[PDB]
């Protein structure tokens, strides 16, 4: 009985993920991906048909056509409105499987698919702590460090893989306390992140998604740093101490002057606000350095931004600078002229704290 172009029903395709022949498995996975692409119904179906644990399982298959295949299917299944598809991948240990494959990925294409999938999964709160717990060290050591071009002991590459990965990490650090603690205390991670951003800015790129993701990530990690950093009792600064060194601060300020991307503008302001928030030595120093002419205007200037979220970031920043301002003049000068409902309260709480 000679071969043909029969198209199988979804249940069959799923059944074939388990067939003896590897070529059947891989082509099934491939096809599965195609069927899901831009198709929410099919994706949700694959879940209800119990295909997800089967795909997750193939991530362990020795042959690349099969694992790459499964992984590309999972990628599509992990994207879209049906947040239960993401949960499903998590619930059958997708993340440790993905990580396990990552450790042995050798090529960009597979790495591309894995990290993108992780990025997709990371958009979902129920999965963030999972990724933090199982993917942090591999994402850091296998992806960020090697490809960043950074070196503890002094070129950037694989921009796409990096973006996916910085996006994933941005995502899992958006809210959780010990997600921030884990990430920022992860040797090399902050170092490399900053290195990435310099690299981009040295290419006159202050808008790339890769820059955006790294900065939102840095923003999160800066949140409450004066407090959550080991021995918050306050030679070359390493790791999370880089979050509050002049080096990065100047990067934020240059992005405010150079970046035309709301996300980046907002996160750079947010970073500054975070660093300034603390009543601690480095807060005193950063805050003082920031109350200088060129910086104050760069910040204040985005109070005239079209985008609400960036307007709000600047306000928070400015209000933080005013707390121990020792030249009400400079700050008052640059803020006031320019200074939703929550936005209003912020701009108001800020005017107040400026004039004490």
């Amino acid at each position: 009985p000679p071969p043909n172009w029969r198209q199988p029903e979804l249940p069959e395709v799923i059944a074939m993920l388990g067939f003896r022949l590897d070529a059947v498995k891989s082509n099934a996975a491939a096809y599965l991906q195609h069927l899901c692409y831009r198709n929410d119904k099919v994706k949700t179906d694959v879940r209800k048909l119990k295909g997800i644990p089967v795909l997750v399982g193939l991530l362990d298959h020795p042959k690349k056509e099969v694992h790459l295949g499964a992984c590309g299917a999972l990628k599509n299944i992990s994207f879209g409105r049906d947040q239960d598809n993401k949960i499903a991948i998590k619930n059958c240990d997708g993340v440790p499987a993905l990580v396990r494959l990552l450790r042995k990925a050798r090529d960009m294409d597979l790495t591309e698919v894995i990290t993108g999938t992780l990025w997709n999964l990371s958009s979902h709160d129920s999965i963030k702590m999972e990724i933090v717990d199982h993917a942090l060290h591999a994402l850091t050591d296998e992806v960020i460090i090697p490809h960043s071009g950074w070196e503890r002991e002094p070129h950037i590459e694989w921009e796409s893989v990096l973006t996916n990965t910085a996006g994933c990490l941005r995502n899992v650090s958006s809210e959780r306390s010990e997600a921030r603690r884990k990430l920022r205390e992860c040797d090399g991670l902050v170092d490399a992140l900053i290195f990435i951003v310099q690299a981009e800015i040295g290419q006159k790129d202050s808008d790339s998604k890769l820059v955006e993701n790294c900065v939102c990530l840095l923003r999160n990690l800066s949140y409450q740093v004066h407090r959550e950093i080991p021995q918050a009792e306050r030679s070359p600064a390493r790791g999370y101490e880089l979050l509050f060194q002049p080096e990065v601060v100047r990067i934020y300020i240059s992005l405010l002057k150079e970046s035309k991307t709301p996300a980046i503008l907002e996160a750079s302001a947010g970073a500054i606000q975070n660093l300034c928030a603390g009543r601690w030595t480095y807060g005193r120093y950063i805050r003082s350095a920031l109350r200088q002419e060129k910086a104050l205007s760069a910040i204040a200037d985005l109070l005239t931004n079209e985008h609400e979220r960036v307007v709000k970031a600047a306000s928070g920043a400015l209000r933080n600078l005013a707390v121990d301002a020792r030249n009400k003049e400079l700050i008052g000068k640059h803020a006031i002229p320019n200074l939703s409902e929550d936005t209003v309260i912020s701009i108001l709480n800020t005017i107040n704290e400026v004039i004490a």
Binding site: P3, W5, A28, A30, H34, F79, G116
Partner: peptide
Amino acid sequence: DEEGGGEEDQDFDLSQLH
């Protein structure tokens, strides 16, 4: 948050399904 991974179409050999 943002599902930056997105999705892609994919190629396959239908004639091997079976």
